[PDB]
Design a protein around this ligand. Structure first.
Ligand SMILES: [Cl-]
Ligand SMILES: [Cl-]
Ligand SMILES: [Zn+2]
Length: 315
């Protein structure tokens, strides 16, 4: 006797594809790799309770390939398995509201994710993939599991792996609309003369080598090919924020002079991030944990500042 149930397959959890499945064959035999809200059911045979449920599958026909690209803006063939593998864990994390922002209770080396998430809620940024638009709206409301699993997938990180905040923000900015961001730099060498450069988009909002936006406006010393140090300084900025990054070093954060920052304690192989936000006072958000202080010093790695339009007075 042949028993069947109706189920729906999907790549985006919006467009559904009706299937009739044979209860005597695994999902994998019928669909390939198959997931039920992040759980791998490939090796499982259909259960009566599955009738009418939605299963994720891999994009295995042209209809699904188009739906997956339009939703996620990737064609990496391992993306949906990585997204589902992460979601099976992130759906069990907790997302407390801390000082009015969605955070993440510590689990699985997720500190870098927590500080990224907290940062996004303080800067003006809109995502391009519908998957991130939809998941980020859910995360602002407090249900951040899908957004966190998407960050893991986009960044090619698994649950439990040590991530870097700067690199994570780079990936997130790469799928955001920063097209009207522009940065003009001047590099002055006493031997070689001056060279201006213009940067756009993600490169216009990120700098690696100093935490201080004021120092970047005055000049920072960098190597020249002639062997002298040259001075690099900001000529013109058009963006709604800037991100200044450096290897971790002791640094003073002064109330009212930055938006938010990330602190890293540890070494190359293992460590822990915390988040500092400048509000009515300095709040230090460490996953679920919250403390306050009027002054702050620690091993800071990234600082975010508000911007709109800046033009140098340096001639
Ligand atoms: Cl968005
Ligand atoms: Cl600021
Ligand atoms: Zn030179």
């Amino acid at each position: 006797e042949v028993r069947t149930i109706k189920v729906f397959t999907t790549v985006d959890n919006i467009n559904l594809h009706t299937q009739v499945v044979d209860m005597s064959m695994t999902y994998g035999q019928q669909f390939g790799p198959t997931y039920l809200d992040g759980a791998d059911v490939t090796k499982i045979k259909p259960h009566n309770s599955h009738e009418g449920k939605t299963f994720y599958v891999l994009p295995n026909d042209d209809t699904l390939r188009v739906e997956a690209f339009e939703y996620y803006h990737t064609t990496d063939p391992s993306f949906l398995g990585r997204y589902m593998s992460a979601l099976n864990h992130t759906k069990k994390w907790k997302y407390p509201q801390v000082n009015g922002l969605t955070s993440i209770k510590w689990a699985d080396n997720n500190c870098y994710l927590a500080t990224a998430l907290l940062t996004l809620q303080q800067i003006e940024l809109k995502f391009n993939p519908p998957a991130l638009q939809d998941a980020y709206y859910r995360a602002r409301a407090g249900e951040a599991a899908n957004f966190c699993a998407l960050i893991l997938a986009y960044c090619n990180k698994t649950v439990g792996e040590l991530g870097d905040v700067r690199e994570t923000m780079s990936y997130l900015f790469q799928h955001a609309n920063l097209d009207s961001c522009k940065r003009v730099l001047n590099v002055v060498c006493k031997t070689c003369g001056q060279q201006q450069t213009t940067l756009k988009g993600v490169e216009a909002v990120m700098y690696m080598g100093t935490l201080s936006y004021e120092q970047f406006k005055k000049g920072v010393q960098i190597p020249c090919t002639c062997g002298k140090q040259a001075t690099k300084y900001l000529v013109q900025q058009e963006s709604p924020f800037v991100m200044m990054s450096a290897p971790p070093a002791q640094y003073e954060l002064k109330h009212g002079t930055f938006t938010c920052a990330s602190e890293y304690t540890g070494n190359y192989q293992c460590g822990h991030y915390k988040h500092i936000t400048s509000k009515e006072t300095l709040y230090c958000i460490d996953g679920a944990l919250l403390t306050k202080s009027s002054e702050y010093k620690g091993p800071i790695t990234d600082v975010f500042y508000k911007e709109n339009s800046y033009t140098t007075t340096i001639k």
